[PDB]
């Protein structure tokens, strides 16, 4: 069910990403504004995945190393012993920092893809 994995560990919860993804689009003037706003939030997330180079994916790996200062827990204590709510709270102060690093990495990747040849 929708958010059924909310209390599950991150590992188990990562297996239901399509359940939450579908509910972002399907789930007087004030209601038209509400629909436009829901569309704007969806596109905001799609544009953010776009600049990160993660379009079309549910799970997208990057080339940004994980910094032990953000969290020094082992993977077993993250994926099997902690939920996503707890994780998002634990690294909340670094979320924007991580997002900026992802964008920077993609920008470097773009330079390595679009400027390899003269006018090509």
């Amino acid at each position: 069910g929708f958010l059924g994995a909310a209390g599950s560990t991150m590992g188990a919860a990562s297996m239901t990403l399509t359940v939450q993804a579908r509910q972002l689009l399907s789930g007087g003037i004030k209601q038209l504004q509400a629909r436009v706003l829901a569309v704007e939030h969806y596109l905001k997330d799609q544009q953010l995945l776009g600049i990160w180079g993660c379009s079309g994916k549910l799970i997208c790996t990057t080339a940004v190393p994980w910094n032990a200062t953000w969290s020094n827990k082992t993977l077993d204590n993250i994926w099997n012993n902690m939920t996503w709510m707890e994780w998002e709270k634990e690294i909340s102060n670094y979320t924007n920092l991580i997002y900026n690093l992802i964008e920077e990495s993609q920008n470097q990747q773009e330079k390595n893809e679009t400027e390899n040849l003269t006018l090509c």
């Binding site: 958010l3 599950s8 919860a13 990403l17 997208c60 940004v64 993977l75 994926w79 939920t83 998002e88």
Partner: protein, 436 residues
């Protein structure tokens, strides 16, 4: 010889944060028209969430939505400005509760005056002279009185408040939850249960019952200025009757602008009243004091009628059959309990046709009379109580009926819901690098 972990982005992560958004309304009449969307619970295991019924923006939105709908419904209808004239009133029969008032009003044809008669309640007219005959409408010289649309029904029906996509409503499933703090049994819904937008000042009618016991909720229980909301686990039936058999007439005051008033009363004139079973109320008060003694330890609990005089402040008001009743609840809140006591009541009622439910400045609404007799039967599903201050250092607490504004009634049904925004993106370490 390095330990290398990388950031991985996950979209569709089951996380959320508190948020305030625009909600829509579904239903199976102003409410059927407004809540036009036709009318799914997922239990979240191992999820603890913090609720606060007194900081719930769903109540504020319900309040604004009800006021906006009410005000919008009255716009395309007859204004009573032509009736703000001196009335020549004589007692219809009580001893003067209903008067037969005559006046000179322009009829549906311009530049033509017609003497007309109308029936008014004592509460709707004020003397304007010392001749014991001249009356004026209670507030027509300072406000615009709009006649309720005769074809628009304001009867409350169950409605459901629904979140837009990208948002969800979390429900607390703890049957004895006190309305604030952590809840360990949380489910996700898209829409709330069916809530009836019933308007009342002291007793909550046609609401939801508690499932295990009477639950008494208050923001503090030590601040005498806070409303105590008592949710019952068993309802008390209140049968309200307007025994007068009224024959209605329609007099025109403009080009298709009809004023509705009682033309005649068939039979005698009898007092409107509500009948509450004495044994059920006495048992209800017994169980209420048993629960109140848990918050106010070793205290005497005394129920008294509220102060203020004005019927809209101290009487129990409600919409019964389309009429607005103001009933004297003194017989319900006049008792002393010491905690060691084991365990028909007829409330007289007045009818008021000119009302201002939300204290709008310069505006009022006139409820046209309904002919025949009126009967209704409502379930008392909860109480609003306040405490008197000045009772420190004594053994007796004084409780009186009443509360704050209408939000306390709407807060009594939405107390178990909160709206949250879904945050589908998140990041986490994993031992896997982008293959580029």
């Amino acid at each position: 010889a390095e330990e290398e972990l990388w950031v991985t982005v996950y979209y569709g992560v089951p996380v959320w944060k508190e948020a305030t958004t625009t909600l829509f309304c579904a239903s199976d009449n102003v409410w059927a028209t407004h809540c036009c969307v036709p009318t799914q619970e997922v239990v979240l295991e191992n999820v603890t969430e913090n609720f606060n019924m007194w900081k719930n923006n769903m109540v504020e939105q319900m309040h604004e939505d009800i006021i906006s709908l009410w005000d919008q419904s009255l716009k395309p209808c007859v204004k009573l400005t032509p009736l703000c004239v001196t009335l020549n009133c004589t007692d219809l029969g009580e001893k003067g509760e209903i008067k037969n008032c005559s006046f000179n009003i322009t009829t549906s044809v311009r530049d033509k005056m017609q003497k007309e008669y109308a029936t008014f309640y004592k509460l709707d007219i004020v003397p304007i002279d010392n001749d014991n005959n001249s009356y004026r409408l209670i507030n027509c010289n300072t406000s615009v009185i709009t006649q309720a649309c005769p074809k628009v029904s304001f009867e409350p029906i169950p409605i459901h408040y629904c979140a837009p996509a990208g948002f969800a409503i979390l429900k607390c499933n703890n049957k004895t939850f006190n309305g604030t703090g952590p809840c360990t049994n949380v489910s996700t819904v898209q829409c709330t249960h069916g809530i009836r937008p019933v308007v009342s000042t002291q007793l909550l009618l046609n609401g939801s019952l508690a499932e295990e016991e009477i639950v008494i909720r208050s923001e503090n229980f030590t601040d005498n200025g806070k409303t105590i909301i008592v949710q019952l686990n068993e309802s008390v039936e209140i049968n309200c009757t307007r025994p007068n058999n009224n024959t209605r007439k329609s007099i025109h005051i403009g080009p298709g602008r009809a004023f509705y008033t009682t033309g005649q009363i068939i039979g005698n004139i009898r007092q409107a009243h509500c009948n509450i079973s004495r044994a059920k109320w006495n048992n209800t008060l017994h169980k209420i004091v048993k629960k109140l003694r848990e918050q106010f330890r070793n205290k005497t609990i005394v129920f008294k009628q509220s102060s203020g005089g004005d019927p809209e402040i101290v009487m129990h008001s409600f919409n019964c059959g389309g009429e607005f009743f103001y009933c004297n609840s003194t017989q319900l809140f006049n008792s002393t309990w010491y905690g060691n006591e084991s365990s028909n009541i007829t409330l007289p009622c007045r009818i008021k046709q000119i009302i201002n439910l939300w204290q709008e400045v310069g505006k009022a609404m006139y409820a046209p009379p309904i002919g025949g007799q009126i009967r209704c039967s409502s379930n008392i599903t909860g109480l609003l109580l306040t405490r008197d201050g000045g009772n420190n250092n004594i053994t007796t607490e004084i409780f009186r009926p009443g509360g704050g504004d209408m939000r306390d009634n709407w807060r009594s049904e939405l107390y178990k819901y909160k709206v949250v925004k879904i945050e589908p993106l998140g990041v986490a370490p994993t031992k896997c690098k982008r293959r580029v």
